Amino acid sequence: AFDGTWKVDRNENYEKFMEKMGINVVKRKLGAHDNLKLTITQEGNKFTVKESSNFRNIDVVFELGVDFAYSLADGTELTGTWTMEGNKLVGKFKRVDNGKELIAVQEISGNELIQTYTYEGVEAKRIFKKE
Numbered sequence: 001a002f003d004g005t006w007k008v009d010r011n012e013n014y015e016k017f018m019e020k021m022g023i024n025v026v027k028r029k030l031g032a033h034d035n036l037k038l039t040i041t042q043e044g045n046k047f048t049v050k051e052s053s054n055f056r057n058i059d060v061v062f063e064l065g066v067d068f069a070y071s072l073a074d075g076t077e078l079t080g081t082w083t084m085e086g087n088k089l090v091g092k093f094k095r096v097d098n099g100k101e102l103i104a105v106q107e108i109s110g111n112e113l114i115q116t117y118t119y120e121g122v123e124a125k126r127i128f129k130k131e
């Protein structure tokens with residue numbers, strides 16, 4: 001599964017996705033080189049993710065199928081759920097400020113972890129390698 005420590009390797013269309021989200025030019029450069037590392041552990045229906053990046057170090061804890069709130073590094077708040085569909089984690093979120101939907105899918109491709117995000121018609125992906 002997703003268990004383990006994962007470190008971001010490369011991105012696809014990420015700066016354009018950040019621009020749509022409204023992140024300023026300089027911040028997008030920083031975002032794209034965030035050194036993000038995720039440590040994922042599961043305990044039944046619940047996941048604990050240690051998110052560690054140049055921006056912050058926080059714990060993200062959620063139960064599959066239960067809504068929870070999550071804040072983006074820039075302060076943007078989302079609420080939504082993650083559910084396991086097949087072998088992927090599908091996340092359906094909504095920004096609290098403007099009510100717009102933000103979808104995220106997480107899947108394993110060989111030995112890489114791929115996250116894909118969609119927002120307002122733009123897609124982005126972040127690919128992680130296992131440490």
Ligand SMILES: CCCCCCCC/C=C\CCCCCCCC(=O)O
Nearest residue numbers: 023027031049060070072073074104
């Ligand atoms: C200044 C830097 C701005 C960074 C903007 C980030 C863009 C949006 C990213 C992804 C939203 C993913 C929502 C997932 C909730 C936590 C679950 C998980 O990551 O496994």
